[PDB]
Structure 1
Amino acid sequence: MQVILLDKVANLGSLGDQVNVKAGYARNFLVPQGKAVPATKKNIEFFEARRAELEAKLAEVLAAANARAEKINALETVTIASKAGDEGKLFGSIGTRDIADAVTAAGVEVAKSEVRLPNGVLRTTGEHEVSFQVHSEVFAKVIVNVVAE
């Protein structure tokens, strides 16, 4: 299936580049999410304009939605305790603010029900997927870190 890319899917190809993909993988994901378009040069500027009119509902929260990242998004390394030992294993956590804090030595307050764990709960000291919202469908990664014993 010959398509053109509209998203930062750098493992599949470059932005505005024309690539070959499978028709099912396109139909189930890349097409409905607004990430790729069929390679017909006279019909693509319309599909891009159709995504811009849906971007106009959250473009202001891609600009500013975190008081600590007012012009560009930041990557942060965790500073809250990893609650494990030298074996790198733990019972995990149940507290919705007991994890993912990267400014622990400061008077900065952790957000309620804004944490997202894409692969599951941290039950090891291993590196895994962890993010915090800035808006209801817009997330920033944070890097998990071994801290205290």
Structure 2
Amino acid sequence: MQVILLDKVANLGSLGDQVNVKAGYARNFLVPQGKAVPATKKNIEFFEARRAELEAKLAEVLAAANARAEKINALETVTIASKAGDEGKLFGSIGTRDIADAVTAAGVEVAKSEVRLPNGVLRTTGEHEVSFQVHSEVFAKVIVNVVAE
């Protein structure tokens, strides 16, 4: 009544049940060739490493990706004119590129897949707000501005 599937198979358990499981069912099938289980001290703790090393992410990984809003905020004004013209409109296309690519105007690079703006940005020149959306866990803030040339 104590096993650790991990490889769930229609059984009332996934990633291996740590609580009362079926018995005699595994002695000849489950365990052999199927998903070995022995929920006995030894084997137990050994599974934690296989999982606790996955949770270290919320502590460590989150950190290696949360500094986003902090690494990029004090940023110098993004001066990427989007060809402001047309008697008061623009020519440049404001969508995905200039938003993100506005960072390697010195070197650093990002991924265009992190932008946060439902509506497309009206092709203006004002304080183009750019809520950097690296990951759900962490959001950041960026800006964009157009100039005349």
What TM-score, normalized by structure 2, do the two folds share?
0.42
In the alignment, what sits opposite 2:49? 49
Q: Which has the larger radius of gyration?
A: 2
Q: How far apart, in 2, do the equivalents of 1:73 and 1:11 lie?
A: 49
Q: How far apart, in 2, do the equivalents of 1:72 and 1:137 lie?
A: 16
> What is the DSSP-based 3-state SS (H/G/I as helix, E as strand, rest coil) of the residue aligned with 1:64?
helix
Q: More deviation in 20-29 or 62-71? A: 20-29
RMSD: 12.7
**Structure 1 residues 89, 134: closer, same or farther in 2, change over 3 A?**
same
Q: Which runs of 5+ in 2 are unaligned?
A: none
**Is the contact between residue 130 and residue 141 of structure 1 (CA under 8 Å) also seen in structure 2?**
yes
Q: Which runs of 5+ in 1 are unaligned?
A: none
Quote the sequence identity (%): 100
> Alignment length, in residue pairs?
149
Q: How far apart, in 2, do the equivalents of 1:122 and 1:25 lie?
A: 64
Which structure dedicates a bigger proportion of its chain to helix?
2
**Structure 1 residues 46, 113: closer, same or farther in 2, change over 3 A?**
same
Q: More deviation in 62-71 or 6-15? A: 6-15
> What is the DSSP-based 3-state SS (H/G/I as helix, E as strand, rest coil) of the residue aligned with 1:36?
coil
What TM-score, normalized by structure 1, do the two folds share?
0.42
**Is the contact between residue 70 and residue 140 of structure 2 (CA under 8 Å) also seen in structure 1?**
no
In the alignment, what sits opposite 1:127? 127
Which structure dedicates a bigger proportion of its chain to strand?
1
